Amino acid sequence: NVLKTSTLIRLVQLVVSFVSLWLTAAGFLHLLENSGDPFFDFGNAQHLTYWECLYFLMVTMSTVGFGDIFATTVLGRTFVVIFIMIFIGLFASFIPEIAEILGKRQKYGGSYKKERGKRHVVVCGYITFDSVSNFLKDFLHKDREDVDVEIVFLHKGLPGLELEGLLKRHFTQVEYFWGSVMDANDLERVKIQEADACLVLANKYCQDPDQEDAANIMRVISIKNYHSDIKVIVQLLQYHNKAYLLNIPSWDWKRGDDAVCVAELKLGFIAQSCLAPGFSTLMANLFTMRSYKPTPEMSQWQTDYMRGTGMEMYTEYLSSAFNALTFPEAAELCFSKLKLLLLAIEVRESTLAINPGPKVKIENATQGFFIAESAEEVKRAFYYCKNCHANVSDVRQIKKCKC
Amino acid sequence: RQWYSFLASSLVTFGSGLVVIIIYRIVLWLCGWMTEAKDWAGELISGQTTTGRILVGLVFLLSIASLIIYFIDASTNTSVETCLPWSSSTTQQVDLAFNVFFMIYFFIRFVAANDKLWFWVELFSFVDYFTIPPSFVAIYLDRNWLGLRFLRALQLMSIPDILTYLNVLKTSTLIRLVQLVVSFVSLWLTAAGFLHLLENSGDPFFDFGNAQHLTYWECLYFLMVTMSTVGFGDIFATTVLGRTFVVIFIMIFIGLFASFIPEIAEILGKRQKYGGSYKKERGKRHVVVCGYITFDSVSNFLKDFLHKDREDVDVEIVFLHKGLPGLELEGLLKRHFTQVEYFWGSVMDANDLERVKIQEADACLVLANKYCQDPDQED
């Protein structure tokens, strides 16, 4: 049972038959030439080694034919003519076979290998050049706040040319595997236990979204069943399909699993834009990486706009200097003293509150939500001291041992 | 027979480091300052550091320089071990300098090795075990075995990545091509050195008395004459080792090539038959056509627009459409080819509007399917 699949069987059959033909034919020619032949009363022999005859049949079977070891018995010559034809005939019958058993190989087989401290996240579902691009252009954006993780796709069937071009264009970061998250063996090839999350993607233009959402749910069931505590993020098409995720035993959004719903957000942005014109873009930029790269030939309005597109959301724990302030005071200090815009806070029992009323106090070690240039720019809110640093003018030194 | 002194140095280098790695692992099985250098070496090898990238480019260029020293040595003629005293001699010690540079680089990787086992049984580690140790034997013994020094040529396999770093090649087709062509010359150059060594040596069964004094250039030619299956029989081999290497070379070339026939067919087949741009011949005017371009829709227009008289005025007629014309339209196009041009493309793309010089065409005509199954969509 050393060989298993039909391809290896055939191969071994073909290769065995080939060496069997070659070894035997060499003995036959060796006999004739070392004998001479009866027409010349065995006087016309060539004293060839069997090794020369084995070599000579390779040199002729390959159609190279150096003409170093030519035959001279009439029986040798006539055997060589038959050998040429019967080899061409046998080989021509096997050309198709060879082409098939060569062609059956998967171009995207194998397993992912975990390079110790290098992290990665898995992607599966509706993987297509467009659906990949709009994700990948953010996930592999030219800055990420200086963090790198590998991105590993698995899908069944081939990527198609445009996606293969995109894959090759990023090949140090990205990997693709033939397979499906419906199979525990593929969840093992892709080391799901050692990936830190899995992202599941869907066809926004599916001709029946109930079926696409049913298919994407199935997966989350497969992934959660294989290893309970994995982080999962799933793209649903319709709103009401979210109900089914809450039924899965090891689904927990407080723990940190999540579902993004296309119909919920797509119309929700449009709706807020009816209440406040243009707001859709304020939102769409504030939650996606953009490159602030001002140049002198830009218009004045384009430069101010871009700097505005450079803004990002971050979150941080506030300094003890914020203890028992009211929210408007914390916001005034963040804006005026730190040059940070503070939107919202985590408050205990967990809940999120945006622009809280003056009736609240900011409690110790609450997490705040900031709009800023970079995560580094926000760290001042964690460090700032009402005794030690409130006197400081230039904010680029607020991190210190005094507290 | 001085040559055994050289190849022994390669063998003991490989075997002693192998045994040390085996001891390490089995001892740790049967029972931190490194970690900075580990990752720092990994960066320099990645070439995401500009230094690491530069040094990789230099490692590659210096590998090409090493082969020139080998071809000059092969240009010296005479037997496979032949020498004169090294004292201020010729140019020799430049490849000692290159060998220690490569051994230093080999230590870097050893540091970055991950699994020492698979690092020690690596193709380029074999290249290093063969070339590095005999270089010292040569200057020490005051003698020169030509040896396996041509193996360094496998570093030509760097070219696809170097041209990716410099971004000289872009599309997947050019990538592949360059990979295939590089692998082909790497195989050809190296195989020639291997055969050259055998035949100029003779072989042990005939106590090295049966040699052929082939140049490396003859061996490089001879492998082309056999790889092409032409086989003139002018430069036939005669060592048993040469003959048996030639038999293996024939089979392994046929096997490699047969695996790549499909690939070659695909990367050949992907070319657009109707690519390119229209070039404006100054005072010659033209008008653009696009939309439902089909043999019939073309014909009934074209038979008026290119009618045998027009009141004596001539302008070129330039179609663009996505996908191929089909045979009957291609026949009509060839039948008028001095007047008419066809381009793969669409007026939905500003780059195609530029290839077709829309700013310098004097009009554009847009054509539609009269028999569309839903005219609202066609309109």
Author numbering:
A (entry chain B): 214 to 561, 567 to 621
B (entry chain A): 14 to 44, 79 to 426
The authors write:
The large-conductance calcium- and voltage-activated K+ channel (BK) plays a fundamental role in establishing negative feedback loops to control the firing patterns of neurons, transmitter release, insulin secretion, and smooth muscle contraction. BK channels comprise four identical α subunits (Slo1)2,3 with seven transmembrane segments (TMD) and a large C-terminal cytosolic domain (CTD). A voltage sensing domain (VSD, segments S0–S4) and a pore-gate domain (segments S5–S6) reside in the membrane. Additionally, two homologous regulators of the conductance of K+ domains (RCK) in each subunit (RCK1 and RCK2) assemble as a tetrameric gating ring (4× CTD) and serve as the cytoplasmic Ca2+ sensor.
Neutralizing arginine at position R3 (R202Q) drives the VSD towards its resting state, as suggested by the rightward shift of Q-V in the homologous mutant in hBK36. The R3Q-apo data set, however, led to two classes with C4 symmetry. In the resting VSD structure (R3Q-apo), R2 faces the intracellular solution. Remarkably, the VSD structure of apo R3Q is like apo WT but results in a considerably narrower pore (radius ~4.2 Å, HOLE) compared to the WT apo structure (radius ~5.7 Å, HOLE). This narrowing exposes a more hydrophobic profile due to the side-chain rotations of residues F304 and I308. In this structure, the side chain of I308 represents the narrowest point in the permeation pathway (radius ~4.2 Å, HOLE). We suggest that R3Q stabilizes a deep closed state of the BK pore and that conformation is evidence of an activation-deactivation gating mechanism based on reorienting the S6-based inner bundle helix. However, the tight closure at I308 was sufficient to occlude entry of bbTBA in R3Q apo. This observation suggests that previous BK apo structures are consistent with a partially closed state, and only when the VSD is in its deeper resting state (R3Q apo) does the channel finally adopt a fully closed conformation. In the R3Q-apo, the αB helix is partially unfolded at its ends (residues: L374-K381), unlike in the R3Q Ca2+-bound state where the αB helix (residues: L372-R382) is reminiscent of all our open structures. The CTD at 0 Ca2+ exhibits a weak interaction with segment S5–S6 at PGD in the R3Q-apo structure.
